[PDB]
Enzyme design. Structure first.
Site, PDB file in Angstrom:
ATOM      1  N   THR A 298       0.813  -1.239   0.010  1.00  0.00           N
ATOM      2  CA  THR A 298      -0.131   0.001   0.039  1.00  0.00           C
ATOM      3  C   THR A 298       0.855   1.137   0.036  1.00  0.00           C
ATOM      4  O   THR A 298       0.306   2.121  -0.386  1.00  0.00           O
ATOM      5  CB  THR A 298      -0.966   0.116   1.209  1.00  0.00           C
TER       6      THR A 298
ATOM      7  N   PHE B 127      -6.898   4.566   6.411  1.00  0.00           N
ATOM      8  CA  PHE B 127      -6.291   3.521   7.269  1.00  0.00           C
ATOM      9  C   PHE B 127      -7.127   2.816   8.223  1.00  0.00           C
ATOM     10  O   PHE B 127      -6.786   2.405   9.238  1.00  0.00           O
ATOM     11  CB  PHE B 127      -5.317   4.497   8.221  1.00  0.00           C
TER      12      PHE B 127
ATOM     13  N   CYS C 107      -5.050   0.856  10.960  1.00  0.00           N
ATOM     14  CA  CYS C 107      -3.735   0.602  10.543  1.00  0.00           C
ATOM     15  C   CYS C 107      -2.624   0.856  11.757  1.00  0.00           C
ATOM     16  O   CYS C 107      -2.401   2.009  11.985  1.00  0.00           O
ATOM     17  CB  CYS C 107      -3.438   1.389   9.220  1.00  0.00           C
TER      18      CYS C 107
HETATM   19  C1  HEM Z   1      -0.187   3.809   2.198  1.00  0.00           C
HETATM   20  C2  HEM Z   1       0.037   2.988   3.484  1.00  0.00           C
HETATM   21  C3  HEM Z   1      -1.125   2.266   4.095  1.00  0.00           C
HETATM   22  C4  HEM Z   1      -2.435   2.069   3.972  1.00  0.00           C
HETATM   23  C5  HEM Z   1      -3.270   2.997   2.818  1.00  0.00           C
HETATM   24  C6  HEM Z   1      -3.058   1.287   4.965  1.00  0.00           C
HETATM   25  C7  HEM Z   1      -4.251   0.825   5.118  1.00  0.00           C
HETATM   26  C8  HEM Z   1      -4.659  -0.043   6.213  1.00  0.00           C
HETATM   27  C9  HEM Z   1      -6.315  -0.430   6.485  1.00  0.00           C
HETATM   28  C10 HEM Z   1      -7.430   0.305   5.668  1.00  0.00           C
HETATM   29  C11 HEM Z   1      -6.156  -1.257   7.506  1.00  0.00           C
HETATM   30  C12 HEM Z   1      -7.400  -1.712   8.133  1.00  0.00           C
HETATM   31  C13 HEM Z   1      -8.181  -2.842   7.219  1.00  0.00           C
HETATM   32  C14 HEM Z   1      -9.332  -3.450   7.869  1.00  0.00           C
HETATM   33  O1  HEM Z   1      -9.715  -3.033   8.595  1.00  0.00           O
HETATM   34  O2  HEM Z   1      -9.526  -4.727   7.404  1.00  0.00           O
HETATM   35  C15 HEM Z   1      -4.753  -1.448   8.129  1.00  0.00           C
HETATM   36  C16 HEM Z   1      -4.495  -2.344   8.841  1.00  0.00           C
HETATM   37  C17 HEM Z   1      -3.250  -2.696   9.139  1.00  0.00           C
HETATM   38  N1  HEM Z   1      -2.109  -2.257   8.555  1.00  0.00           N
HETATM   39 FE1  HEM Z   1      -1.906  -0.879   7.139  1.00  0.00          FE
HETATM   40  N2  HEM Z   1      -1.959   0.448   5.728  1.00  0.00           N
HETATM   41  C18 HEM Z   1      -0.659   1.316   5.152  1.00  0.00           C
HETATM   42  C19 HEM Z   1       0.584   1.091   5.794  1.00  0.00           C
HETATM   43  C20 HEM Z   1       0.956   0.066   6.533  1.00  0.00           C
HETATM   44  C21 HEM Z   1       2.221  -0.346   7.000  1.00  0.00           C
HETATM   45  C22 HEM Z   1       3.710   0.338   6.422  1.00  0.00           C
HETATM   46  C23 HEM Z   1       2.371  -1.195   7.918  1.00  0.00           C
HETATM   47  C24 HEM Z   1       3.435  -2.154   8.703  1.00  0.00           C
HETATM   48  C25 HEM Z   1       4.637  -1.802   8.558  1.00  0.00           C
HETATM   49  C26 HEM Z   1       0.736  -1.672   7.842  1.00  0.00           C
HETATM   50  C27 HEM Z   1       0.246  -2.767   8.676  1.00  0.00           C
HETATM   51  C28 HEM Z   1      -0.946  -2.901   9.086  1.00  0.00           C
HETATM   52  C29 HEM Z   1      -1.499  -3.841  10.094  1.00  0.00           C
HETATM   53  C30 HEM Z   1      -0.636  -4.831  10.790  1.00  0.00           C
HETATM   54  C31 HEM Z   1      -2.823  -3.967   9.862  1.00  0.00           C
HETATM   55  C32 HEM Z   1      -3.968  -4.562  10.867  1.00  0.00           C
HETATM   56  C33 HEM Z   1      -3.835  -3.733  12.215  1.00  0.00           C
HETATM   57  C34 HEM Z   1      -4.803  -4.518  13.334  1.00  0.00           C
HETATM   58  O3  HEM Z   1      -6.236  -4.960  12.904  1.00  0.00           O
HETATM   59  O4  HEM Z   1      -4.313  -4.585  14.373  1.00  0.00           O
HETATM   60  N3  HEM Z   1       0.110  -0.955   7.129  1.00  0.00           N
HETATM   61  N4  HEM Z   1      -4.127  -0.661   7.052  1.00  0.00           N
HETATM   62  O1  IC6 Z   2     -12.393  -5.392  -2.277  1.00  0.00           O
HETATM   63  C1  IC6 Z   2     -12.496  -6.116  -1.176  1.00  0.00           C
HETATM   64  C2  IC6 Z   2     -11.818  -5.943  -0.132  1.00  0.00           C
HETATM   65  C3  IC6 Z   2     -10.325  -5.736  -0.164  1.00  0.00           C
HETATM   66  C4  IC6 Z   2      -9.587  -5.224   1.017  1.00  0.00           C
HETATM   67  C5  IC6 Z   2      -8.168  -5.147   0.881  1.00  0.00           C
HETATM   68  C6  IC6 Z   2      -7.284  -5.851   1.986  1.00  0.00           C
HETATM   69  N1  IC6 Z   2      -6.205  -4.870   2.597  1.00  0.00           N
HETATM   70  C7  IC6 Z   2      -4.831  -4.763   2.280  1.00  0.00           C
HETATM   71  C8  IC6 Z   2      -4.251  -4.136   3.133  1.00  0.00           C
HETATM   72  N2  IC6 Z   2      -5.116  -3.589   4.269  1.00  0.00           N
HETATM   73  C9  IC6 Z   2      -6.222  -4.290   3.516  1.00  0.00           C
HETATM   74  N3  IC6 Z   2     -13.803  -6.828  -1.662  1.00  0.00           N
HETATM   75  C10 IC6 Z   2     -14.896  -7.696  -1.169  1.00  0.00           C
HETATM   76  C11 IC6 Z   2     -15.555  -8.385  -2.392  1.00  0.00           C
HETATM   77  C12 IC6 Z   2     -16.477  -9.573  -2.265  1.00  0.00           C
HETATM   78  C13 IC6 Z   2     -17.939  -9.350  -2.034  1.00  0.00           C
HETATM   79  C14 IC6 Z   2     -18.969 -10.466  -2.115  1.00  0.00           C
HETATM   80  C15 IC6 Z   2     -18.445 -11.575  -2.398  1.00  0.00           C
HETATM   81  C16 IC6 Z   2     -17.207 -11.962  -2.930  1.00  0.00           C
HETATM   82  C17 IC6 Z   2     -16.246 -10.835  -2.737  1.00  0.00           C
HETATM   83  C18 IC6 Z   2     -14.300  -8.807  -0.313  1.00  0.00           C
HETATM   84  O2  IC6 Z   2     -13.209  -9.459  -0.057  1.00  0.00           O
HETATM   85  O3  IC6 Z   2     -15.119  -9.979   0.262  1.00  0.00           O
HETATM   86  C1  4MN Z   3      -2.610 -10.202   4.211  1.00  0.00           C
HETATM   87  C2  4MN Z   3      -2.499  -9.008   3.540  1.00  0.00           C
HETATM   88  C3  4MN Z   3      -1.788  -7.985   3.738  1.00  0.00           C
HETATM   89  C4  4MN Z   3      -1.603  -6.843   2.752  1.00  0.00           C
HETATM   90  C5  4MN Z   3      -2.045  -6.998   1.732  1.00  0.00           C
HETATM   91  N1  4MN Z   3      -1.841  -5.670   0.896  1.00  0.00           N
HETATM   92  C6  4MN Z   3      -2.928  -7.962   1.075  1.00  0.00           C
HETATM   93  C7  4MN Z   3      -3.124  -8.946   2.128  1.00  0.00           C
END
Ligand code: HEM
Ligand code: IC6
Ligand code: 4MN
Ligand code: HEM
Ligand code: IC6
Ligand code: 4MN
Lengths: 451, 452
Positions: free
Chosen positions: B265, B390, B397
Site C-alpha cells: 500500500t 487507514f 492501521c
Molecule cells: C499507504 C500505506 C497504508 C495504507 C493505506 C494502509 C491501510 C490499512 C487499512 C485500511 C487497514 C484496516 C483494514 C481492515 O480494517 O480490514 C490497515 C490495517 C493494518 N495495517 Fe496498514 N496501511 C498502510 C501501511 C501499512 C504499513 C507500513 C504497515 C506495517 C509496517 C501496515 C500494517 C498494518 C496492520 C498490521 C494492520 C492490521 C492492524 C490490526 O487490525 O490490528 N500498514 N492498514
Molecule cells: O475489495 C474487497 C476487500 C479488499 C480489501 C483489501 C485488503 N487490505 C490490504 C491491506 N489492508 C487491507 N472486496 C470484497 C468483495 C466480495 C464481495 C462479495 C463476495 C465476494 C467478494 C471481499 O473481499 O469480500
Molecule cells: C494479508 C494481506 C496484507 C496486505 C495486503 N496488501 C494484502 C493481504
C-alpha cells in the site's frame, strides 16, 4: 548536570515568586525560560519542577517514586485528614479506603449513578431555558452548581439544591475560604496578627464537619436502602484486614469526596465550553454528534458512552488546562533522573501538568491550538504524555465518574442550545488550588427540544 | 427502507459483476448509479456496500460494529494466519499481538527506524542520478523496490537489495502470485472446477517460498548485533495483560503479515502522489519550495521530515482520491438500525467503499475530483469519519505513522534532488490486485545536482 533555578529574593529564596494570584501560570513561564527542569527553594523546602515527557515518564515509575504530599495537601489535612487524597501511601488508611471504595467507581456503579446525574443535568437545562431575552449565563458558577449537586446526590443522597440559590451553598463558602487560607499559608511566622485567620479557619472547618454530621445522621435515620458512595463507606469491608472504615476516616472521606468530587470537574466543563465557543468548527462537530446520538428526551447510559467526539473535546480541554495542575512525588531510593540529575532518597518532584501537555516534541509544534482530533486514536498518544488524572495507584479514583458526568452534561448542553460569545470573552484563568476561567459568560438560544 | 441492488445473473446473483480486472472501480460505478448503499449478493454471502459519510460515520461506531473479515482477508489467512491484519478481534492472538507490537510504532521507535529509512531512500536517489540521457523511470516498480526494502531493513534487519535486481525478488514473485490466486478465488463463478487444481498446487508452493524466507529471517536473528526493531519486539516483547510473549506459530504469521502490509500500500501511495504532482504543476512547485527550504542537510533528519507540512498534505490528498487499501469490512454486533432507514440483524455484513466515501460531494464540495492538498490544512473542519484511508478504531492501521514518515521522507528527497517530466502525457491506468496502483506510470527526472 547543573540544574537551573529562577530568580531569588535573599533569605526567602524563590518563595516570593509564588506570592501572586496566578502562581501556576507564573510557574509555566519559568518553565518556558528554563526548560524541562528547574530547582525551586523556599524556607525549609526544596523541590524540582518537571515539564518534559522525557523526565516525567521516569518519575511515573512507581518502583522508583511514590506520591508525595505537596505543602498544599499537607495543610489540607486539617480538614481532609487521612482521606484518600491527603494521605500517604504507607498510611494504613489509604490502602484500606482504596480497597473499600474502588468498587463504587466501577462500570456497574456508573450505571447506577447515571439516573441521578440526569436529575441534576435536567435542572441545568431548565434553568437556561427559563432565561428571559438577552439574559446571559455565568458559566463557571452554573458548572459548580451542577458538579456539587451531582456528587452530593450521587454519592450521598443529599441535595445541595444549588439551582434554588443565587448565593453559593454555605458549605462551599467555608470550603472556598478554608482553601483560600491554605493558599495563604503557602506564600506566608505565627504572630498574633494571624489569630483571627486561625479562628476563621477553625470556624470554616466546623461548618464543613456540621454538613458531614447531617449527611451521616440522615443515612442512619434514613430507613431506605441506597447503593451509593456513602453505602460502601459505612458497610464495605477491606478484604485484607476484614475491617470497615472507622469513624474518623469516614468523615474525612466525605469531606474529601465533596471537594475533590466537584471543583476540578466544574473547571473542566467551563474550559470545555470556552474552547467550544472560541472554535466554531469544533462546536459544530460536537453539536452534530450530540444531536444524532442523544435522540431521547433523557440520555441513557449507553448513549453517553457513544459521544466519542465530546470525549475528545473534554480530553483536549484537559490537555491545555488540566484543572488539577500538578502532583507531587518523592524518590523512594537514591536514583538518577534522565541519566544526568542525581537525586537522593526523599528528594521531591513537582509534575507541572500544563507544561507536560505543551511538550512540542510529543504533540508537535502547534501545542497551543485546540484540536480534539489529537485524540481520535488513543493508541497514538505516547505513554505518560497525557496526565490530567495523576499517575499509577495514586491516580484519580473518580476519573470515570468525572468523565461520565461531563460528557452527559456537555452533550445535553450542545443538543438543547446554540451558544454565543457575545462579549468576545478574553480568557482569564483564576487560580485557587485548581484552575477555572473567571467571568466567562455566554448567551444561549434554545433549540426548543423538550425533555 | 428498501435497499437497491445491481443486476443479477440467476443463481450466481451479483457475483459475475466482480469477474473483471478492475472490481473496485466497477463497484464505484455501481455506487454512482445506486447511491449511498446497495446490497450485493453472491452464492453463500450477502453484504452491503456503503458510500456516504452519513452512513459510514455510524458504521465506525465500535459499540455497534466490529471488524469483519472480508472474503479477501479470509482467503489470505492461508498464509497470514492469525496475524494482526487477518485475525478476528475476539481471537486471543489479536489483542496480545496488538499490545506487544504497538510500541514498535511509537515515536521513539520511529526515531530508531529513521536512519535505515534514509539508507534505502539514498539508494533510490542514487539510482535516478545514475540514469543516462533520455532514460526514464518506472515509478510504481521503483516505489515497490523502496518500500519493500524499507520494511525489510527497518523491521527485520534483512536486506532484499531490490535496487540490485532487474526481476522482482523471489519473495514477491510468489507473493504477487499468491495474492493473485486470492483475487481469483473471489471472482470464480464456480469455485472448485478442475481447471483450478494446478492453481491450488501453485498456491501452496508460493506459500512455501514466503515461509522459507521467514525461516531465514528468524534463523539470521537467532545467530547473534543487538537490535531494537520490529522483530525484536516480536521475539522478546511480553503482553502486559497476560504476561506471556507470542509463541512461534504466531510470530511467523506476523512476519509474513508485516512484510506484505508494510510495503504494497505504501508503494501505491507514493506512485499516486507522484502522479498527482506531475499532473498539477502548481502543487508540485509548492511542495518543491518546501523540500528546498526544509531539507538543508545532505541527509534528512527525523525533525526535518516532521516539518514537511505540505508534503504530508500532498500524501493525504493522494489517499483521498485513491486510497491504496480500497475497502474494509464490518459486522453488526447487535440488532441495530442504520441511518434510521436500514434495519440490520446481528452478524449482518457491511463493506466501506473508501474511494467512493472520499468523493462524497456533501463533504468535499464541488471539486471532489480535483487535487487540492489545501483541503487538509485544518482537521477540525473535516466532518467525523469522512477520511478513512487507514481503517477505523482499534483495528485501524498500526503502521500508519511508519508509512506516512517513510513516504514523506522519500517524496521530500525526490522533490529536492530532481525536476520531473511527464514526457508521455501519461493517462492514468489503475491496476487492481487487493490494492490499487497506477500501471505503466513513467516519468523523466533531470537532476538538480545537489550532492548527498
Ligand atoms: C499507504 C500505506 C497504508 C495504507 C493505506 C494502509 C491501510 C490499512 C487499512 C485500511 C487497514 C484496516 C483494514 C481492515 O480494517 O480490514 C490497515 C490495517 C493494518 N495495517 Fe496498514 N496501511 C498502510 C501501511 C501499512 C504499513 C507500513 C504497515 C506495517 C509496517 C501496515 C500494517 C498494518 C496492520 C498490521 C494492520 C492490521 C492492524 C490490526 O487490525 O490490528 N500498514 N492498514
Ligand atoms: O475489495 C474487497 C476487500 C479488499 C480489501 C483489501 C485488503 N487490505 C490490504 C491491506 N489492508 C487491507 N472486496 C470484497 C468483495 C466480495 C464481495 C462479495 C463476495 C465476494 C467478494 C471481499 O473481499 O469480500
Ligand atoms: C494479508 C494481506 C496484507 C496486505 C495486503 N496488501 C494484502 C493481504
Ligand atoms: C476533571 C475532573 C478531575 C480531575 C482533573 C482530577 C484530578 C486528580 C489528580 C491529578 C489526582 C492525583 C493528585 C495527586 O497525585 O496528588 C486525583 C486524585 C483523586 N481524585 Fe480526582 N480529579 C477529577 C475528578 C474527581 C472526582 C469526580 C472525584 C470523586 C468523585 C475525585 C476524587 C479523587 C480522589 C479520592 C483522589 C485521591 C485518590 C487516591 O490517591 O487514592 N476526583 N484527582
Ligand atoms: O499548587 C501546588 C500543588 C497543589 C496541587 C493541587 C491539589 N489537588 C486538587 C485536586 N487534585 C489535586 N503548589 C506547590 C507549590 C509550592 C512549592 C514550594 C513551596 C510552597 C509551595 C505546593 O503546594 O507545594
Ligand atoms: C483536599 C482537596 C481536594 C480537592 C481540591 N480541589 C482541593 C483540596
Amino acid at each position: 548536570k547543573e540544574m537551573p533555578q529562577p530568580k531569588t529574593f535573599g533569605e526567602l529564596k524563590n518563595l516570593p515568586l509564588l506570592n501572586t494570584d496566578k502562581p501556576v501560570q507564573a510557574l509555566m513561564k519559568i518553565a518556558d525560560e528554563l526548560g524541562e527542569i528547574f530547582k525551586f527553594e523556599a524556607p525549609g523546602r526544596v523541590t524540582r519542577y518537571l515539564s518534559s515527557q522525557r523526565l516525567i515518564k521516569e518519575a511515573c515509575d512507581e518502583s522508583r517514586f511514590d506520591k508525595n504530599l505537596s505543602q498544599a495537601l499537607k495543610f489540607s489535612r486539617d480538614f481532609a485528614g487521612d482521606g484518600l487524597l491527603t494521605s500517604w501511601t504507607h498510611e494504613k488508611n489509604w490502602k484500606k479506603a482504596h480497597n473499600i471504595l474502588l468498587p463504587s467507581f466501577s462500570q456497574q456503579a456508573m450505571k447506577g449513578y447515571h439516573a441521578m446525574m440526569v436529575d441534576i443535568a435536567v435542572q441545568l437545562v431548565q434553568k437556561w431555558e427559563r432565561l428571559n431575552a438577552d439574559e446571559h449565563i455565568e458559566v463557571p458558577e452554573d458548572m459548580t452548581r451542577l458538579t456539587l449537586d451531582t456528587i452530593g446526590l450521587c454519592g450521598f443522597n443529599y441535595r445541595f439544591n444549588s439551582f434554588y440559590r443565587d448565593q453559593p451553598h454555605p458549605f462551599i463558602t467555608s470550603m472556598v475560604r478554608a482553601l483560600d487560607e491554605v493558599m495563604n499559608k503557602l506564600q506566608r511566622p505565627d504572630d498574633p496578627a494571624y489569630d483571627e485567620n486561625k479562628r476563621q479557619f477553625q470556624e470554616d472547618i466546623k461548618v464543613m464537619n456540621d454538613l458531614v454530621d447531617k449527611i451521616i445522621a440522615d443515612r442512619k435515620a434514613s430507613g431506605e436502602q441506597s447503593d451509593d458512595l456513602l453505602t460502601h463507606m459505612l458497610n464495605g469491608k477491606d478484604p485484607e484486614t476484614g475491617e470497615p472504615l472507622d469513624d474518623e476516616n469516614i468523615r474525612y472521606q466525605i469531606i474529601t469526596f465533596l471537594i475533590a468530587g466537584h471543583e476540578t470537574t466544574s473547571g473542566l466543563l467551563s474550559f470545555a465550553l470556552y474552547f467550544l465557543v472560541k472554535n466554531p468548527h469544533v462546536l459544530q462537530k460536537a453539536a452534530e454528534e450530540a444531536a444524532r446520538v442523544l435522540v431521547d428526551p433523557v440520555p441513557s447510559y449507553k448513549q453517553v458512552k457513544q459521544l466519542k467526539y465530546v470525549g475528545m473535546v473534554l480530553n483536549e480541554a484537559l490537555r491545555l488546562w488540566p484543572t488539577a495542575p500538578a502532583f507531587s512525588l518523592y524518590a523512594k531510593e537514591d536514583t538518577v533522573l534522565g541519566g544526568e540529575y542525581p537525586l537522593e532518597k526523599g528528594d521531591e518532584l513537582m509534575v507541572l501538568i500544563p507544561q507536560l501537555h505543551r511538550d512540542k516534541t510529543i504533540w508537535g509544534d502547534d501545542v497551543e491550538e485546540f484540536r480534539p482530533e489529537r485524540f481520535e486514536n488513543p493508541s497514538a498518544i505516547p505513554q505518560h504524555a497525557f496526565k490530567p488524572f495523576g499517575n499509577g495507584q495514586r491516580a484519580c479514583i473518580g476519573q470515570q465518574f468525572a468523565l461520565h458526568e461531563a460528557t452527559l452534561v456537555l452533550g445535553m448542553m450542545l443538543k438543547h442550545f446554540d451558544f454565543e460569545d457575545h462579549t468576545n470573552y478574553e480568557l482569564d484563568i483564576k487560580e485557587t488550588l485548581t484552575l477555572k476561567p473567571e467571568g466567562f459568560v455566554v448567551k444561549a438560544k434554545s433549540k426548543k427540544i423538550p425533555l
